[PDB]
């Protein structure tokens, strides 16, 4: 064969923050040295758009090129469910490759955020685990973070979303803190970003007594 096309959605945090710019990315791999010319046609709900930009061409070191077109999307357009189509044309392709992306279909559902304190058995170690259960949300596109006193707390790991038995998603975020920080009464907040939350944001706090 010839080139292969991969079409990527915007980053969830970028579609949810008005202060950020979301974008759809059309990646073309296995572009040959003999025919590096790639034609991009972009469609938003079948309507051809002309404002995409081509990223600088990259040599991959396996005798192929990586050709990329990026299309900036409107936050509300992505959240409304518009389909973005990338049509890739190249001499090595028998016919053009068309790939599509859009937000997952289904009525969006609001996440229920619950902070769970560490166990009595967890309180006899050097560090304690603070849990954030995020459940009943739809689609699975979410951003989960942790802070304390206005500063980001970066010692966390979030599970990928799990499909629940009611068709919604759930995940858990785990923040690891020194036992003394927790014991001293410090507040730890779990921030969640999702389209179905009022103002795409919610924060839930946790402290000892």
């Amino acid at each position: 064969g010839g080139p292969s096309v991969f079409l990527f959605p915007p980053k969830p945090k970028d579609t949810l923050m008005i202060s950020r710019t979301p974008e759809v990315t059309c990646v073309v791999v296995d572009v040959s040295h003999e025919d590096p010319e790639v034609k991009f046609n972009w469609y938003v709900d079948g309507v051809e758009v002309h404002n995409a930009k081509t990223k600088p061409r990259e040599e991959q070191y396996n005798s192929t090129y990586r050709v990329v077109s990026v299309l900036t999307v409107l936050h509300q357009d992505w959240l409304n469910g518009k389909e973005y189509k990338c049509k890739v044309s190249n001499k090595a392709l028998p016919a053009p490759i068309e790939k599509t992306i859009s937000k997952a279909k289904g009525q969006p559902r609001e996440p229920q955020v619950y902070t769970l304190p560490p166990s009595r058995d967890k309180l006899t170690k050097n560090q304690v685990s603070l849990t954030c259960l995020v459940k009943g949300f739809y689609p699975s596109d979410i951003a989960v973070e942790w802070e304390s006193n206005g500063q980001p707390e970066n010692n966390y790991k979030t599970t990928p979303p799990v499909l629940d038995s009611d068709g919604s998603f759930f995940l858990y975020s785990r923040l690891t803190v020194d036992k003394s920080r927790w014991q001293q009464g410090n507040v730890f907040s779990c921030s969640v970003m999702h389209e179905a939350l009022h103002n795409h944001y919610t924060q839930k706090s946790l402290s000892l007594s």
């Binding site: 923050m17 008005i18 202060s19 009022h198 103002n199 795409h200 944001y201």
Partner: peptide, 13 residues
């Protein structure tokens, strides 16, 4: 009202 995340604007209704 507006929602802010670490001093960055999230969204307003």
């Amino acid at each position: 009202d507006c929602a802010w995340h670490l001093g960055e604007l999230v969204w307003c209704t």
